[PDB]
Amino acid sequence: KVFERCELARTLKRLGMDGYRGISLANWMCLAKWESGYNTRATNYNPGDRSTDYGIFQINSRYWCNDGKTPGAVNACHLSCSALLQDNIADAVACAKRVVRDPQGIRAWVAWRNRCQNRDVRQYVQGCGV
């Protein structure tokens, strides 16, 4: 599914992402926007290391979900990567929460650093009622 901006903002708020481990809602919005264009079915293969990024938050198979075909990978979220391609993002959110529980926090996604860090991210939630 391709979420609309405010629809996603309200969904994430309800799922408890606002301020999760110190990360504001607008930061999560910025991340989803640049990683997948708010698309839950997005997948991106990385030829370089044979891993794949899945779903709205582009979560990597080397550490977070199992896809069976990534060499030497782990599954910290304890999920099949298929779980990250559903229209319902509850599993993806629970996994994103797990990723930021590691020391890097939101910095774990390089797109966050490139496109969201130290920027005015208010834009992503303006007028959504969140």
From Swiss-Prot:
Cytoplasm as UniProt keyword: no
InterPro entries per UniProt: Glyco_hydro_22, Glyco_hydro_22_CS, Glyco_hydro_22_lys, Lysozyme-like_dom_sf
GO terms, biological process: antimicrobial humoral response; defense response to bacterium; defense response to Gram-negative bacterium; defense response to Gram-positive bacterium; inflammatory response; killing of cells of another organism
Cellular localisation: Secreted
Taxonomic placement: Eukaryota, Metazoa, Chordata, Craniata, Vertebrata
Lineage: superkingdom: Eukaryota
Gene Ontology molecular function: any one: lysozyme activity
C-type lysozyme domain ranges (all copies): 1-130
Description of how the protein assembles with itself and partners: Monomer.
Catalytic reactions of this protein: Hydrolysis of (1->4)-beta-linkages between N-acetylmuramic acid and N-acetyl-D-glucosamine residues in a peptidoglycan and between N-acetyl-D-glucosamine residues in chitodextrins
Gene3D superfamilies in alphabetical order: 1.10.530.10
Protein name, as recorded: Lysozyme C
Disease: Amyloidosis, hereditary systemic 5: A form of hereditary systemic amyloidosis, a disorder characterized by amyloid deposition in multiple tissues resulting in a wide clinical spectrum. AMYLD5 primarily affects the viscera, and the predominant clinical features are renal dysfunction of varying severity, and intra-abdominal bleeding. Inheritance is autosomal dominant.
EC primary class: hydrolase
Record's miscellaneous remark: Lysozyme C is capable of both hydrolysis and transglycosylation; it also shows a slight esterase activity. It acts rapidly on both peptide-substituted and unsubstituted peptidoglycan, and slowly on chitin oligosaccharides.
Family the UniProt entry places it in: Belongs to the glycosyl hydrolase 22 family.
Keyword Signal in record: yes
Role according to the record: Lysozymes have primarily a bacteriolytic function; those in tissues and body fluids are associated with the monocyte-macrophage system and enhance the activity of immunoagents.
Record-annotated disulphide pairs: C6-C128, C30-C116, C65-C81, C77-C95
Enzyme Commission identifier(s): 3.2.1.17
An example Gene Ontology CC term for this record: tertiary granule lumen
CDD domains membership: LYZ_C (cd16897)
UniProt entry keywords in alphabetical sequence: Amyloid, Amyloidosis, Antimicrobial, Bacteriolytic enzyme, Disease variant, Disulfide bond, Glycosidase, Hydrolase, Secreted, Signal
Pfam families xref list: Lys (PF00062)
Annotated active site: E35, D53
